[PDB]
Amino acid sequence: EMRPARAKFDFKAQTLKELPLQKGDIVYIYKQIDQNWYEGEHHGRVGIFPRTYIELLPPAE
């Protein structure tokens, strides 16, 4: 049920809840927490990042 996504831009974390991302990173989303933020994981670490900074990826064959 986790949704794959790829970062379209760098995202700098400014709070201890946020997950930093580098453009091109593949991340996995658990849920949407509010209008602007997803909660997800990168390399097993959980945090939040912006909806608009990622693209949702299609399923693998």
């Binding site: 831009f9 927490i33 509010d34 602007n36 933020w37 608009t52």
Partner: peptide, 10 residues
């Protein structure tokens, strides 16, 4: 270059 940054959740 990146999209407008959203504020942290309420």
């Amino acid at each position: 270059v990146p999209p407008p940054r959203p504020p942290p959740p309420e």
